Design a protein that fits this description.
It is classed as protein transport. It is built from eight helices and two strands; from the N terminus they run E-E-H-H-H-H-H-H-H-H. The protein is 68% helix and 3% strand. The protein is mainly alpha-helical.
Length: 380
């Protein structure tokens, strides 16, 4: 609907390792679910992240993807792309703001799940939202580790279902995706390596004019070289700004593509879990109760009514699983059609960044080269 935020208020408590900021959020969307219709909240970086990961666990157990926030607490410390949570204090605040508004736009991008009242009232107020969210409670961590170790053994026969007709595309694109993101972000790290010393070389190009000041001083030469100074500074500013912004755009796109793909691979892993749930449910309910029917001639009506209500309730649970297969697959239809429209949306976003680079390149290159035109038609 309406989302126009102003990220302000750098309330720094500690500097260096994982700086926590109560930053301003100008809360739009004046729909009548939002009470005051004009309000701005503060959001403390120690507070809302843990509660949002709690709510992310909640809408993960019914089954959805999460938008990645600015990450911390073993998520923003262990190989986001390199690491360095020490740098999230003063210089990568712009990276925090960028991925923060990516997170906010992806919050907007689930309009069916946008009608969640608790997170709307929490982002609607500024209440210092429940500061116990900074946490280390990974007792489910090793649990899901050996669950992943079991799924890596027992995924194969369930892959052969109708799931294959929907997963062969995702497997092909995740193989091509990990190949192209390996190559592309390796190019990004080499860009981080050499664009900075390229900017330093442009600074030494400027200092070469003082080196010319240590030589013959002719003013016709001096005007030309002092004009070339601001020429190379404009060129350095333009393409270094492009090499910064478009490349961390594509880096954030690769990162949240990785995280959303990991979420949906985990979701199909839970669908395989529900497969083995109904499978061993049916195996116990049939084998054990036809072993009771087998043991009819231990004649009492106790195991007869036990057989009856056990097969009734537990095959009702089996039918719950076989209907929840269409429920989970329908949720999969929803979130993968969300993926096609979201891929279209952020492909449009980085392609409008490309043609926006073309547009500001057109108007900037045009304006300062026509500003250089009279001093090209005259002495430089």
């Amino acid at each position: 609907f309406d989302l126009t935020v102003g990220i302000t208020d750098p309330e720094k408590i500690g500097d260096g390792m994982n700086a926590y900021v109560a930053y301003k959020v100008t809360t739009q969307t004046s729909l009548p679910m939002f009470r005051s219709r004009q309000f701005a909240v503060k959001r403390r970086f120690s507070d809302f992240l843990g509660l949002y990961e709690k709510l992310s666990e909640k809408h993960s157990q019914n089954g959805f993807i999460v938008p990645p926030p600015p990450e911390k607490s073993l998520i923003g410390m262990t190989k986001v792309k390199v690491g360095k949570e020490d740098s999230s204090s003063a210089e990568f605040l712009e990276k925090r703001r960028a991925a923060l508004e990516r997170y906010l736009q992806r919050i907007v991008n689930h309009p069916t799940m946008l009608q969640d009242p608790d997170v709307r009232e929490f982002l609607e107020k500024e209440e210092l939202p429940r500061a116990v969210g900074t946490q280390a409670l990974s007792g489910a961590g090793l649990l899901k580790m050996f669950n992943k170790a079991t799924d890596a053994v027992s995924k194969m026969t369930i892959k052969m279902n109708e799931s294959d007709i929907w997963f062969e595309e995702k497997l092909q694109e995740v193989e091509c995706e990990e190949q192209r993101l390996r190559k592309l972000h390796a190019v990004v790290e080499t860009l981080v390596n050499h664009r900075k010393e390229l900017a330093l070389n442009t600074a030494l190009f400027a200092k070469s004019l003082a080196m010319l000041g240590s030589s013959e001083d002719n003013t016709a030469l001096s005007r030309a070289l002092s004009q070339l100074a601001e020429v190379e500074e404009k060129i350095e500013q333009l393409h270094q700004e492009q090499a910064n912004n478009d490349f961390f755009l594509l880096a954030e796109l690769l990162s949240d593509y990785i995280r959303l793909l990991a979420i949906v691979r985990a979701a199909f892993d839970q669908r395989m879990k529900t497969w083995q749930r109904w499978q061993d449910a049916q195996a116990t309910l049939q084998k054990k109760r036809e072993s009771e029917a087998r043991l009819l001639w231990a004649n009492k009506p106790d195991k007869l009514q036990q057989a009856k209500d056990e097969i009734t309730e537990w095959e009702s649970r089996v039918t719950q699983y076989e209907r929840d297969f269409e429920r989970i697959s329908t949720v999969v239809r929803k979130e993968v059609t969300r993926f096609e429209k979201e891929k279209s949306k952020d492909f449009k976003n980085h392609v409008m960044k490309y043609l926006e680079t073309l547009l500001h390149s057109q108007q900037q290159l045009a304006k300062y080269w026509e500003a250089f035109l009279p001093e090209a038609k005259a002495i430089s």
